[PDB]
Design a protein around this ligand. Structure first.
Ligand code: MOO
Ligand code: MOO
Ligand code: MOO
Ligand code: MOO
Ligand code: MOO
Ligand code: MOO
Ligand code: MOO
Ligand code: MOO
Lengths: 71, 69, 70, 69, 74, 69
């Protein structure tokens, strides 16, 4: 499906740390940036994510804050 | 402040659409990637954000989903 | 795209409240239940949402709280 | 308590997956729909949740995205 | 209703800024602390919120991050 | 970094429950109030959090709901 989430960034799985009900997936999205995602193990398995998979980090605009260097 | 948010991505403001109590800030983070942020107008003002300002897109890991084709 | 969001609930748009930068879409998901979604106006336009449109409410499991009668 | 969260959907617990600090509660809300909720084990215990418990899925409007085919 | 949100903080409304579809409510929770809440106008009206109302800031634990001073070297 | 998060509440760590990939940090922020935070174990470690550490509970305004009696 097509989603309203304003942030949908293509990337490659670099690591998967499995937990009890959740795991943490790291995505290399290019330009030297990586995105860490804390999601359910159910989705990590069901999506077939493993190191090297093509995927997207998907983030709703209301979940994204803005910060600055306070110099 | 140093924050627990796993995602702290440097970038430049490319647009700011102001709203009533919130506004939407778009940040170019490089590599052809842009991040859209919906935050309070009060914070857009207090941080002095305008097109061209340096900033960071800050995202908690528990807020990030994974997608595939 | 297939998403990790554990909750993907089919529904019918019943109303759309346009705001300044955000809007609120109400989805009838059947059985007398509706889901309200506060999203960007840009997304409402890009997806072509209108009253009567078929859509899905998408919710990450970590965004869902549980309640009970006390 | 009466909460501002616009989404409050009654349901029946169909499973509870206990984890280390969190667990996952699956609620059948009727009509073939289920809601999965990832919450703290402390709250799962303090709410007395069990399979078969009556409960509610509570979701802030700002946490709900819209999708289309 | 009884909720799983780990954070349920009693306070009194000190201000309400109305927007187009959302508004921002500020709660004095004591100890010199205030909580800002961005929620729908529908809920601000439906809950009868006005300056002086008793209320709660309700926050899921998974929404709360931890910060420390920059001059801390873990 | 200075953050758009409208809520930045100073407090002291009163408990740490370590989990598998997340943990739960509780902060005493004064006035008889405590704030619970579910964050990644990586961040609990990198920030050096232990009982008694000075910290801030950081919360975006759009994550805060309102309740009443
Ligand atoms: O208890 Mo966990 O570390 O969220 O799987
Ligand atoms: O450690 Mo976090 O604050 O869940 O990204
Ligand atoms: O368009 Mo709004 O009411 O400022 O979020
Ligand atoms: O689904 Mo949105 O438009 O990123 O809040
Ligand atoms: O945290 Mo999920 O498994 O993307 O709903
Ligand atoms: O508490 Mo709301 O009005 O669902 O964002
Ligand atoms: O994730 Mo909780 O236990 O509803 O705050
Ligand atoms: O939505 Mo905010 O202004 O980053 O708390």
């Amino acid at each position: 499906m097509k989603l309203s989430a304003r942030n949908q960034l293509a990337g490659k799985v670099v690591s998967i740390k499995e937990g009890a009900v959740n795991g943490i997936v790291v995505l290399d999205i290019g330009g030297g940036n990586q995105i860490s995602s804390t999601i359910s193990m159910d989705s990590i398995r069901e999506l077939g994510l493993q190191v090297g998979s093509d995927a997207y980090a998907v983030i709703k605009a209301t979940s994204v804050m803005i910060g600055i260097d306070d110099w």
